[PDB]
């Protein structure tokens with residue numbers, strides 16, 4: 001039973017380039033088995049870490065900076081977490097590939113799940129093309145993050161510790177004078193279950209498993225008993241009584257958070273997955289599903305001396321427990337001011353999306369569903385296709401589509417499209433039983449436009465149960481072979497992921 005708020009929040013160091021010039025910035029990152037202590041009272045934990053760190057180093061780039069990262073695997077040939085060998089398939093047991101989540105990235109640098117590699121690239125997957133990924137960064141400033149994306153192993157490799165932040169700074173943002181430097185802090189939130197000996201627990205099977213069930217077996221969801229921020233269990237952060245910017249990243253496998261401050265204070269949302277909102281939005285609470293990012297300002301100016309808990313009210317396999325998962329971290333407003341707070345919390349942030357969208361080239365209707373496998377396990381599917389089935393989502397480069405995502409299942413799925421960001425058009429409830437019985441879509445209420453939080457640009461979006469969600473994206477500027485998928489990792493791996501081919505005629 002781990003005492004809350006006894007370790008300081010780590011802030012990952014900013015990765016330094018191996019080589020840098022005005023034309024090119026070159027980085028190296030090596031995946032390593034490592035050990036770090038996750039709580040004051042735990043023995044050190046075995047982990048897989050980018051450059052031996054959990055989370056990985058934070059990478060900072062400018063818009064249009066010509067960046068190269070050689071992601072290397074120096075991992076052991078056997079996993080320390082339970083591999084289910086029935087969900088896919090001579091290949092190595094341990095395979096890896098890094099996806100820069102949110103990256104406007106050429107397809108062979110996107111971290112395709114079948115572009116994996118084993119240690120030193122000894123073996124490579126069928127869609128591997130290159131060692132050194134290229135990130136031209138021709139996109140709006142935003143909070144990105146990087147993490148493993150290997151076929152059939154993503155839930156394990158991420159849970160092992162392969163996550164890191166990547167921030168794109170646009171020099172144009174600077175006139176806004178948003179909190180910066182030490183007043184701009186990433187918060188990577190990961191839930192974990194940890195054994196008494198300090199080792200990570202990840203389930204090798206569902207509860208009360210039939211003896212015919214593979215062993216190990218995948219589970220459809222995982223809720224951790226403990227919450228970590230930047231690699232420490234329920235940490236505290238000393239802050240100055242002034243404005244801070246936080247880059248809030250949900251890097252958890254399944255868990256959705258619903259965040260608040262326990263003094264009833266407000267957040268100011270300045271940004272979503274895809275960058276700055278056109279206007280700042282004052283929020284008392286916000287939902288944050290796997291792979292979503294909220295760029296927020298918290299103004300501690302009026303709370304000097306106070307301890308304020310960043311709290312959580314979203315359940316995960318049950319109601320939050322006030323003593324455990326209802327807590328994320330604690331702010332202590334006890335750091336003396338190092339200088340005048342010259343930062344701002346502006347109302348006006350950026351241009352609205354150009355109202356003159358392109359013409360709608362196509363409208364895809366897509367269903368979230370699940371069948372059962374030969375062992376009785378749920379298999380989560382996009383439009384009843386398996387990963388290996390021939391590609392059906394085939395937008396043309398430079399064209400705009402609307403995707404209507406129909407969710408008749410009992411849960412929310414956070415759906416991520418690679419390469420692009422998109423606008424959220426609306427959500428609308430429908431008759432679930434009728435849809436299940438006849439395949440016919442009968443709305444039970446009007447279309448609800450998104451909340452202000454979702455009026456800018458998104459790349460990972462919650463599709464709630466009993467709703468049709470509509471989004472719009474322009475597919476470009478690159479063509480090639482990408483993916484879209486649920487970002488509950490346990491779903492992603494079996495098998496709620498599909499190829500997405502962006503074509504050039």
Ligand SMILES: CCn1/c(=N/N=c2\sc3cc(S(=O)(=O)O)ccc3n2CC)sc2cc(S(=O)(=O)O)ccc21
Nearest residue numbers: 352353354355357358400402422423425472473474
């Ligand atoms: C919310 C406005 N909206 C859409 N926006 N799409 C946009 S706005 C936009 C701005 C830029 S730019 O800012 O980057 O240049 C690039 C691409 C853009 N796209 C295409 C993704 S598409 C749509 C359809 C319906 S309808 O279906 O109900 O008629 C209703 C309302 C709609």
Ligand SMILES: [Cu+2]
Nearest residue numbers: 413486488491
């Ligand atoms: Cu899902």
Ligand SMILES: [Cu+2]
Nearest residue numbers: 099149416485
């Ligand atoms: Cu992905």
